[PDB]
């Protein structure tokens, strides 16, 4: 198969530059993310949005454990 990606010119530059430094090809990089996403049903990035939602739930528990 094949995928065609619309990409900003400057981002093509900086991301490819970085990939050469890492010694990973752009195709390998993108096929990893797609395989990951396919198997884990999520993005590989830190779930900090969900993370600091839990942190606020804890802040409410804390306040309530002060005077039960």
């Amino acid at each position: 198969g094949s995928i065609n990606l619309r990409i900003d010119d400057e981002l093509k530059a900086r991301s490819y530059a970085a990939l050469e430094k890492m010694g990973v090809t752009p195709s390998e990089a993108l096929r990893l993310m797609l395989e990951y996403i396919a198997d884990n049903e999520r993005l590989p990035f830190k779930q900090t949005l969900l993370s600091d939602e839990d942190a606020e739930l804890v802040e409410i528990v804390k306040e309530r454990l002060r005077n039960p």
């Binding site: 839990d54 942190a55 739930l57 804890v58 409410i60 528990v61 309530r64 454990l65 039960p68």
Partner: protein, 71 residues
């Protein structure tokens, strides 16, 4: 296990069938490590609705202590 509710949590509950269905499973063997609310001592969470109940398990009194119910 015993079941305790904080006064605030009980006010939340009044305003439930499916959660109660999960609570009785919680009442026997209360520590489900997968729902561990990490960052807090002995606290855990309980598909639809997206509502959240939070309880603490206290080994020394065998109680499940429901602290918060909502979103």
């Amino acid at each position: 296990y015993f079941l305790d509710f904080d006064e605030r949590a009980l006010k939340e509950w009044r305003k439930r069938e499916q959660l109660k269905k999960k609570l009785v499973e919680v009442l026997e063997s209360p520590r489900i490590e997968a729902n561990k609310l990490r960052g807090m001592p002995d606290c855990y969470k309980i598909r639809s609705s997206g509502y959240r109940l939070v309880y603490q398990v206290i080994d020394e009194k065998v109680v499940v202590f429901v602290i918060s119910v909502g979103k």
